[PDB]
Amino acid sequence: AHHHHHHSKENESLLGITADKITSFADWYSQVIVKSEMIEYYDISGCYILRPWSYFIWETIQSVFDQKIKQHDVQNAYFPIFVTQKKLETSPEVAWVTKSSDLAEPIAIRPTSETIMYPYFAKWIRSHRDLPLKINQWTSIVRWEFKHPTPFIRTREFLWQEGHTAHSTRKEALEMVDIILNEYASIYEDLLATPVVKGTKSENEKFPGGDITKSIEGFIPEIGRAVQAATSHLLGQNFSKMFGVEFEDEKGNKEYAHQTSWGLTTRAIGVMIMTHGDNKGLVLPPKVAPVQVIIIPIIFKTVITEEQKKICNEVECILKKAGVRVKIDDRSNYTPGWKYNHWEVKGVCLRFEVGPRDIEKRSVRVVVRDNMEKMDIPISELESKIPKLLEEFQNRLLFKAKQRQNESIIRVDTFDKVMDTLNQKKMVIAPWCEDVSCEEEIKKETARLAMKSLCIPNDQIFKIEEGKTKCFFCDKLAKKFTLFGRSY
């Protein structure tokens, strides 16, 4: 459903998008991220260059989320990129530095900072008055993935954020986990306009050395594969016992700290691209669009007139004062049709066509990117209407994407109707016993004919009769309903 709106002659050219999003997804995703000047392929597999058009989106995610964790008294720090083998162990996806002259003991590039920070958490934490401790850092992470890499979704090097907190009680640590999860869900929905499902991971899908793991799950209806959006781990007293992170509570006894760890990576950018894009190229939500309004004065070869420069400057002046990020494309090198497709490929929310008739009426022609809505707005109303249009743009993207996610979830009660649903490129919600043994047989049978538990949704829309309702696989007392499907 990415081919409904009108295409121009420039959109059907090579400077547009050639592949269809549904029938040829991988080629579509490559053309969208490359022709929009977001990604540049690197001579090292799995690594990609974040060009200014895409790095702007990551900077906005930084500004919003960093300001949210500071509301909860989370402080930023920085830990070394290297780690020793003895510390890293109390494996195949860890890059090892062995030479500089070889090294007697090779050092490793951090896949995560648990083994780096917690040896010093045990040093910094001695009393209950020293808790809670909340540390975060914005850094890059290297993980040599064995599967075929995908830009943003699965890269060997990616930018991320990792928060690590320590608490005096499990209760305080758990409500810290829910806070970061709701902020993670707020990033995808309130900022990226991408719908995600808040839930709890299964025992077989949770963080390895953790206690409880909660996450948000994203899904791509076109490819029919799920994508894990972000994770928030309740580590409990597991890691504190390994590194000796114990505090002295009131009453004098010794107790191991209750820790949490949570991360969000540049995978969020890719899930957004695949959620909103169409056959013209990028479709960006206005809250992360590098340019929300592009002003295209009708001019070819000849220089821009003094009246066109006067109109385009005051329109830019009104939008700049109104908080809208706007640029003027007065390049006489390309035709107006060329500029339309150019800024549509890179997902500019609105374009302003400024012709001689628009200067006479003191209005501008506005064309909306996602739905090709056309309208005349007087200049006297730009300060008010254009912020509203960008608000309507953001709301429309989230609404249309959310009704595609609900459309991609099918309720199943018996394993006989499970396979037919998955090939429809849809997820499965089913009653499940949440046992590790049951999940191991589900992934084996689904692969022979593989789907895994995506998350146990926090919001249970379907009721389970106590004692009677049985698992959708084999036979056991089902606890509640769990979301399944194949991943990316």
In sequence order, what DSSP letters do the residues of 353-398 get, joined into one string?
A: EE-HHHHHTTEEEEEETTT--EEEEEGGGHHHHHHHHHHHHHHHHH
In whole angstroms, how close is the CB of 162 to ligand PRO at the nearest point?
A: 4
Residue whose CB is less far from ligand AMP, 196 or 312: 196
**162 contact choice in ligand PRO, ligand AMP, Zn ion, none (CB below 5 to 8 Å, kind-dependent):** ligand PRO
Question: Residue 130, class by beta-carbon neighbours within 10 Å (0-12 exposed, 13-18 middle, 19+ buried)?
Answer: middle
In whole angstroms, how close is the CB of 260 to ligand PRO at the nearest point?
A: 9
**145 contact choice in Zn ion, ligand AMP, ligand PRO, none (CB below 5 to 8 Å, kind-dependent):** ligand AMP
Q: Would you count residue 154 as binding ligand AMP (CB under 6 A)?
A: yes
Residue ranges in 195-254 that form contacts with ligand AMP under rule CB under 6 A: 228, 230-231
* Cβ atoms within 10 Å of 18's Cβ, excluding its own: 14
Q: What is the DSSP letter of 191?
A: I
In whole angstroms, how close is the CB of 126 to ligand AMP at the nearest point?
A: 31
**143 contact choice in ligand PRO, Zn ion, ligand AMP, none (CB below 5 to 8 Å, kind-dependent):** ligand AMP
What does the buried/exposed string (b/e) look like for 445-458 if buried means 16 or more CB atoms within 10 Å of the residue's CB?
A: ebeeeebbbbbbbe
Residue whose CB is less far from ligand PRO, 263 or 281: 263
**262 contact choice in ligand AMP, ligand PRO, Zn ion, none (CB below 5 to 8 Å, kind-dependent):** ligand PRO
Q: Would you count residue 438 as binding Zn ion (CB under 5 A)?
A: yes
Question: Residue 193, class by beta-carbon neighbours within 10 Å (0-12 exposed, 13-18 middle, 19+ buried)?
Answer: buried
**476 contact choice in ligand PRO, Zn ion, ligand AMP, none (CB below 5 to 8 Å, kind-dependent):** Zn ion
Interface residue list for ligand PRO (CB under 6 A): 112, 162, 231, 233, 261-263
Q: Which of 260, 265, 446, 453 binds ligand AMP (CB under 6 A)?
A: 265
**Binding string, residues 107-146; x marks residues near ligand AMP by CB under 6 A:** ------------------------------------x-x-
- Give dist(CA 289, CA 164) in Å, integer: 30
**Binding string, residues 389-428; x marks residues near Zn ion by CB under 5 A:** ----------------------------------------
- Give dist(CA 455, CA 483) in Å, integer: 6
Do the strands 197-200 and 282-283 form a parallel or antiparallel pair, or are they unpaired?
Answer: unpaired
Q: Which amino acid makes up residue 387?
A: P
**453 contact choice in Zn ion, ligand AMP, ligand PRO, none (CB below 5 to 8 Å, kind-dependent):** none
Residue whose CB is less far from ligand AMP, 210 or 431: 210
Element (H, E) at 276: helix 267-276
CA max distance for the chain:
83
Size of the site for ligand AMP (CB under 6 A): 12
Q: Which of 225, 267, 276, 369 binds ligand AMP (CB under 6 A)?
A: 267
In whole angstroms, how close is the CB of 206 to ligand PRO at the nearest point?
A: 10
In whole angstroms, how close is the CB of 167 to ligand PRO at the nearest point?
A: 16
Question: Residue 239, class by beta-carbon neighbours within 10 Å (0-12 exposed, 13-18 middle, 19+ buried)?
Answer: buried
Residue whose CB is less far from Zn ion, 317 or 477: 477
Q: Would you count residue 54 as binding ligand AMP (CB under 6 A)?
A: no
In sequence order, what DSSP letters do the residues of 119-171 get, joined into one string?
A: HHHHHH--BGGG--EEEEEEEEEE---SSPPBTTTB-SEEEEEEEEEEESSHH
Q: Would you count residue 476 as binding Zn ion (CB under 5 A)?
A: yes
- Give dist(CA 457, CA 196) in Å, integer: 11
Q: What is the DSSP letter of 453?
A: E
Q: Which of 133, 135, 226, 433 binds Zn ion (CB under 5 A)?
A: 433
Q: 137-141: which pairs have CB atoms within 8 A and are 24 or more residues apart?
A: 137/76, 137/77, 137/78, 137/79, 137/113, 137/161, 137/162, 138/62, 138/66, 138/76, 139/78, 139/79, 139/81, 139/110, 141/110, 141/111, 141/112, 141/265
- Give dist(CA 239, CA 210) in Å, integer: 8
**230 contact choice in ligand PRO, Zn ion, ligand AMP, none (CB below 5 to 8 Å, kind-dependent):** ligand AMP
Binding residues (CB under 5 A) for Zn ion: these are: 433, 438, 471, 473, 476
Binding residues (CB under 6 A) for ligand AMP: these are: 143, 145, 154-155, 158, 228, 230-231, 263, 265-267
